[PDB]
Amino acid sequence: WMVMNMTQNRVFLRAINQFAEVLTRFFMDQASFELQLWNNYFHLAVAFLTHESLQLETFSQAKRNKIVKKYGDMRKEIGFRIRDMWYNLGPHKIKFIPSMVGPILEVTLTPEVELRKATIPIFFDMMQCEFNFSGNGNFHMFENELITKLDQEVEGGRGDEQYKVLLEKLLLEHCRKHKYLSSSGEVFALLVSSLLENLLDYRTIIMQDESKENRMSCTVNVLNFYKEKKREDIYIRYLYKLRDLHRDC
Amino acid sequence: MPPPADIVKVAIEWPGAYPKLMEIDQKKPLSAIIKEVCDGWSLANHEYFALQHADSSNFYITEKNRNEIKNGTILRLTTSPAQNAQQLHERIQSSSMDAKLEALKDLASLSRDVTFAQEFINLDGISLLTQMVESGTERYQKLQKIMKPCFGDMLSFTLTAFVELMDHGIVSWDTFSVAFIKKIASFVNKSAIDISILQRSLAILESMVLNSHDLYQKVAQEITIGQLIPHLQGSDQEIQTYTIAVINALFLKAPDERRQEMANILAQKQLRSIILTHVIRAQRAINNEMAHQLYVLQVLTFNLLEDRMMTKMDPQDQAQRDIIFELRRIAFDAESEPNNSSGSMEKRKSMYTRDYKKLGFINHVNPAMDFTQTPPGMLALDNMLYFAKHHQDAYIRIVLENSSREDKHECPFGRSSIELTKMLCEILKVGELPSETCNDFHPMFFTHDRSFEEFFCICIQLLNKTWKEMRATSEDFNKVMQVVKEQVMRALTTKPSSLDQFKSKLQNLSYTEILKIRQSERMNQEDFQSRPILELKEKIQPEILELIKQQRLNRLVEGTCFRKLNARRRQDKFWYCRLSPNHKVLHYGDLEESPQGEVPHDSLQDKLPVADIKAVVTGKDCPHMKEKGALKQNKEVLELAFSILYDSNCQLNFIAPDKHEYCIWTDGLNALLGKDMMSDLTRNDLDTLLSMEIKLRLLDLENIQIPDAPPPIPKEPSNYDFVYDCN
Amino acid sequence: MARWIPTKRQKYGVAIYNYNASQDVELSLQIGDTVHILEMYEGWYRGYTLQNKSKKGIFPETYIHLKEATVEDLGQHETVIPGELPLVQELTSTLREWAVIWRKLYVNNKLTLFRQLQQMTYSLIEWRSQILSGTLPKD
């Protein structure tokens, strides 16, 4: 009963919208307390956002045509509401990080572009807020698990290359919009894009016939990434994978 | 700059002589052409030669039809037409009978000109012919029993000349005398005449009827119904057409009272029964002239109904009141007591209103207001009288049916009958002149002399049945009209023979199944061969064959259990040959007894260069079948041989379970070679896949006929100016 | 290719047969190539073909069968009987899905399913051709 499901998702969107509007009505700057529920709130928001998407309906164009004729895409307004709420949210984003890192990944790697175009500046805003928090030191504390979760997402099979290119264009724009820390952010993003295309090659060759040399070069590249970025977890696990492959070869 | 056309080539032949050429310009007057011809050929007496065409026409050159002159045509010279007329006149009263025969034969054959006919008649030809016919009445009697055939043939030729002269009307109307009619009557009265003479005489009679009216009365005074019926006994269709045409001529310009009289005579003689048993049951080559005969006889029956229905039934007639009283007595003996038959008029009016308020009549004081409009007028009264006479059971059922209609959708019998009569008159084109080209014929009009009434009864009964099934409303009058028109047209196109069989086949017919089966047959034939349809499927073949090859390759990747050669001494006969998931290498070799199938691993011969494979020989050219030692294979596997040849010294010979799997394998191998397929199953699949695709695509053209000729290319503006923005 | 007017009475652009290659944008159009035309000209029509909705193709009027009917078949009273032509158009959509069905039906051998599907779709197209014209009682 796909029609039942889509109606249910529409009313889920309506429920989330009224949640947002009541939160705006009586959870403003005075209500800096009891904000821990926003964590699970947006967790559920993304958990709802992560179904009934383009690749789900990709089997026949008729499904896409009929759904855009009757409802239109709802994940688009999910992202729009999320981004406007984050714009109106406030400077307490620091506590969001260890929680908000996971959810924003899926919307980061959306199959579409335009909503991703409108959504990318959230990364610029969170990076400048991360500098606000971490001026007394460095600010790896988002990028590390950002790369890790990117790592996990592409392992799930949702990586893309022209998406990177667009990412790089956007972050070049952001660095032009910023000051001396722009060099830091842009080299970080260079590492991000290079490792992402590394894993793109890994995924596009792990389905093709085994070659065992381009993958190994990519893996030593990720090793360089991890050792330069002061991270070890996925580093040790992927060198474990390297040892497994050696054993197999 | 087209080349000038003032110079043309034309050879003028002679009978028994070889041709001579000259340049002839037709724009100049014929006098100049004659002068130039005589000057070129050095011939005197230019007035004693003329020009005629030696083609199939065999006519002379006329100012109106000289355009047939084209370069490179046989043209032989003849003498001048004046000299031809003079010699014919001299030889008319000659001493040689063969000369007379040939001269009259030529005269009749070359009797297809008008102006030359004028010139010949200017020589008192008609007067001389009349004089020799009048004086020849007793002259040929002595030699009649000697040369009846030749004399009859000459008479036929002269009558043909007379007919064509009358058609051109060159002879005057008043010049006709009673001698011609008397001679034709004498010809008819003879009992030893041939079939052709009778046909010519009846043609003369019908021409006489078409000319005037009093001569029609004269011939009808000597016309009996008992002599034109034996003409029907003849199996020839032409004589039947002639007799029917003369019969129609009898109904052309006669008073309507005599029309009814002779119609009653035909009915009492039961002409339609013998017509049905003679011409309808014949399965010979039906002529379009007979179709015209059927159409004009249908028109005659329609006029015989109209001349009695064209008048308006006066509501003030007491006889009409008595007739409708008796009709409603014999119709409504369910609600009306029998005592009202001899009763007063108050109960008559009470029954009128109580029985017409259930039949959609508004006025209750003057019930006969609806009987002043024709068609049909009183035809409905005749139909209901016939219903009471023959269908009294159905009549009573219908009487008890409409009055019991509780669905608030009672059908007005009078209004529906008027509408149906109007539709029938419109579809049958009542009141128009007969067509000169259309040859539609309905053989069911000859089943009964009252055939139209039977047809209308069957139609109204079918309509009542269909309406009872549907229970129609007042909002689908257009639907009712269109469905009845379509069913009537479909019934007419079926060409029925008998009334009962026609009515049964009306119910036996499906819901336009003929159109569907015809469309399917046409599509199948176009698939076999067509100019504007067959090229469509063969034009677009990029995906069907490619995906067939993909399916074959997927069949190769999954693989199956194969068989080995000479595996009788501890050699396993189960093994696998799996294609790479990249579709470039083959994994095959010596394996074990595997009922499960293929085991995923590297085989003994894990490599097979597909670019080094030359071809796959199919049949008796496989080297492994050519051993003369001890490893000979069975003749039973002659259908199971195929070898992958490479290196010119090593052969990959494989064994198949049965035919279809080997066909699959050889199709896969050629697909690796990128060639055509060699499987009956593929051909079995090739037809349907294309058939399925075009069956899908034909829905856009459904209800729309596809033109055969290529549509033209209409002009387009040169500019790309967009009044409405693109995208 | 000038004088193009917006119009909504030509959505069902019925072809005839494989069109000539005189125009680069025009190809050997298939039988079911309904052109969703958004421009009106006296002797030509350029619109979006069903196979490629993103590519325009200029088509002659003599190559276009006049179909004023829209997807809504009651506003213009095109229906032979009300409430039937929506069924035929949803059936057309169903068969356009049947296209991708039999396209994906050959990836895996479904011989029993494939043959019974052949029989069912045969009866389907038979009944569609049967009810191409609505002239039967409502039952």
Author numbering:
A (entry chain B): 1006 to 1254
B (entry chain A): 1 to 727
C (entry chain B): 1 to 139
Quote the original article.
The DOCK protein family activates Rho small GTPases through guanine nucleotide exchange factor (GEF) activity. Herein, we present a new conformation in which DOCK5, ELMO1, RhoG, and Rac1 are aligned on a plane and symmetrically flattened, as revealed by cryo-EM using a lipid membrane-coated grid. Biochemical and cellular experiments indicate that conformational changes driven by acidic lipids are important for regulating the GEF activity of the DOCK5•ELMO1 complex on the plasma membrane and are essential for its downstream signalling.
